[PDB]
Structure 1
Amino acid sequence: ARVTVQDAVEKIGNRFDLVLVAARRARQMQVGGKDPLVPEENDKTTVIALREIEEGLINNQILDVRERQEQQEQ
């Protein structure tokens, strides 16, 4: 779990767009059709998305390109 989101905040620094990005990632991982890109340690989807953001592996641009690639595949 993440007691503080400062590490995730400095990756995409707005403290406001981070909430939207994490909400989108958590929605993807929760409603189905997605699997976590970071090892899952019994914690909920919110902190998984936050840790993916903090590790620098999830961002808005790459989320958009992944959605575009999924649309192109279908």
Structure 2
Amino acid sequence: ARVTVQDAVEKIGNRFDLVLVAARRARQMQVGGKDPLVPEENDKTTVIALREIEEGLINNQILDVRERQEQQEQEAAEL
């Protein structure tokens, strides 16, 4: 649970790019079987996504790199 999102807003300056990146992360959590790297403690997907952003473990660049890598294994799976 996060009362405020400041740590995120200095993690992501725009605070609207923050919404987009953390929304994509939470979408990956709900739709994909992937789970948040930071442990979940009775927290919804958006809250734990903001928590992951807070630690700096997740950002827009890292998220784009991760999805590109996942598409790479998707291509490699077909061979």
TM-score bracket, shorter-length normalisation? over 0.9
Report the alpha carbon displacement of residue 45 of structure 1 after superposing the two structures with TM: 0.4
**Distance in 2, Cα, partners of 1:43 & 1:33:** 17
Residues 47-56 or 31-40, more deviating: 31-40
SS in 2 for 1:23: helix
Q: Unpaired segments of 5 or more residues in structure 2? A: 75-79
**How many aligned residue pairs are there?**
74
How far 1:33 sits from its partner (Å)? Answer: 3.0
> Which whole-Å CA distance do the structure 2 matches of 1:18 and 1:62 have between them?
13
Normalising by structure 2, we get a TM-score of 0.89
Give the match for residue 56 of structure 2: 56
- Is the radius of gyration larger for structure 1 or structure 2? 2
CA distance in 1, matches of 2:68, 2:15: 26
Runs of 4+ deviating beyond 4 Å: none
Taking the aligned partners of 2:4 and 2:65, their CA distance within structure 1 comes to 28
Task: Give the C-alpha shift of residue 32 in structure 1.
Answer: 2.1
Cα deviation for residue 35 of structure 1 reads 1.1
Secondary structure, aligned partner of 1:24: helix
SS in 1 for 2:46: helix
Match of 1:3 in 2: 3
Once the two structures are TM-superposed, the CA of residue 12 in structure 1 deviates from its matched residue by 1.1
Q: Aligned residues: percent identity?
A: 100
CA RMSD of aligned residues (A): 0.8
Task: Measure, in 2, the Cα distance between the counterparts of 1:31 and 1:52.
Answer: 17
